[model samples]
Target: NLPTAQEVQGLMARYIELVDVGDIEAIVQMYADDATVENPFGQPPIHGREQIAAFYRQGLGGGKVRASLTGPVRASHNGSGAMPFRVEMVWNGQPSALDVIDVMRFDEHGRIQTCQAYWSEVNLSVREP
Candidate 1:
């Protein structure tokens, strides 16, 4: 069964919130046991719950990251949602920001089945101190 529009929108909103809150465990549970994620879209995706946990642990563990939506989440009838957002964080001793658009597909149980983030080096900028 496809997920409802409300469910897609709600999760999309909550996903960013949890990311900003640095709740790695909470965020990992939002995905299916065999979920997959492609952070920059071209990299090899990581799969399964344990691998997923490892991914988020490294990405959000620093507590120096923050994210906010640049536009409203777009929910589709096919159990998918796309959101544009900006991430601000200290990367490699420098403050940087990245503009990203993430597209996620939800499972019937409302868990994220797959998440693909669209971004590249061109979308990232380093701020001067």
Candidate 2:
């Protein structure tokens, strides 16, 4: 089963705060001891809490993180977002960004069990600003 609407709201608020700080370990701490992530970067699914943290660290570590959410995010009892959005990153020392759909599911203990980010390499490109 999913969480209550209020619970989902709380989780989302807390998570957004964590991500905004680019705190990889703190973000990862929200996951269950064993969790999984599937991103659109053409890689296989990342499993385990440590690996998930490493994944974000490698990707967003030093970059200015900007997750611009344009979402009509539909959430359910077990999850919060079938959320749609885009992200901007300074990748390879250039401004790059992509559109993504983020799906997140959590455990009863209020920690994430799985997350999948749906995107495509074709949409990931350097921004011409």
Candidate 3:
């Protein structure tokens, strides 16, 4: 069964919320067992549930990383959606924010099959203390 547009948006919303709370396990559960993650796009993809969990453990776990939606979640007709958000985390011992847009493709069961986060060095801004 295909997911409705609202469902796609809802999932994206929950994703940012979960990330904001640093809930790595909950976030990992949203993906399929064989999901692929391409954070910052163009990088080598992180594949499978185990690698995904490891990726998140280093990136989101054991820290206070926060993310907030910057714009509406745009859902496509083909079981995919894109969301713009601001990610605040520690970078090189400094607090910084990265403007990121993530596109997630969902499988029929509503689990994310692929997640591609779009960002670059230009999108990063160091915050003043």
Candidate 4:
């Protein structure tokens, strides 16, 4: 079933909140059981919730890393959402920040089925997953 625009809008809003709270398990559960996630658009994709949870656990639980939506998440009606984001953190004992463009594809049940993030190495000391 196709979701109404309002529903997707609410979903993105909910995602942002989940991320803000850094609830690894809760946020990981938001993805389908077999969802694929590519954190940094070009990296290898993670398959399944178990792998996905492992991927996020380290990054989210690591050194003061926090991300906020720098812009709105726009839905494309194909169960996908895209947004600009900023990540700030103390990585390896040094502060770093990156501008990112994140995209997500949702399942019919509103779980995220895929995720892709775009960013660069203008900074480091941060761990991806």
- By lDDT, who's the top model here? 3
Model 4 per-residue lDDT at 98? 74
Model 2: CA > 4 A from native: none
Decreasing TM-score order of the candidates: 3, 1, 4, 2
**Candidate 1: tens digits of C-alpha lDDT, residues 1-129:** 668887888899999999998888899889999999998899999999999999888888865899999899999989999999999988668999999999999998889999999999899899998
Best by TM-score: 3
- Model 4 RMSD in Å is 3.9
Poorest 10 consecutive residues of model 2 by lDDT?
Answer: 8-17
Error of 1 at 60 (Å): 0.7
Model 4 ranges with Cα > 4 A deviation: 123-129
Off by over 4 Å in 3: none
For model 4, residues 29-70, the per-residue Cα lDDT tens digits are 788999988877778888998998888888777566677877
**What are the lDDT scores of the predictions, listed in order?**
0.92, 0.74, 0.93, 0.76
For model 3, name the residue pairs that clash.
none
Write candidate 2's Cα lDDT for 3-117 as tens digits: 6656765675566567666877888888888998888635688899778888888776766887745765566775655666778778667898877777788777778888887
Number of clashing pairs per prediction, in order: 0, 3, 0, 1
Distance (Å) between predicted and true CA of 30, model 2? 1.1
Clashing pairs in 4: 41-117
Compute the lDDT for candidate 2: 0.74
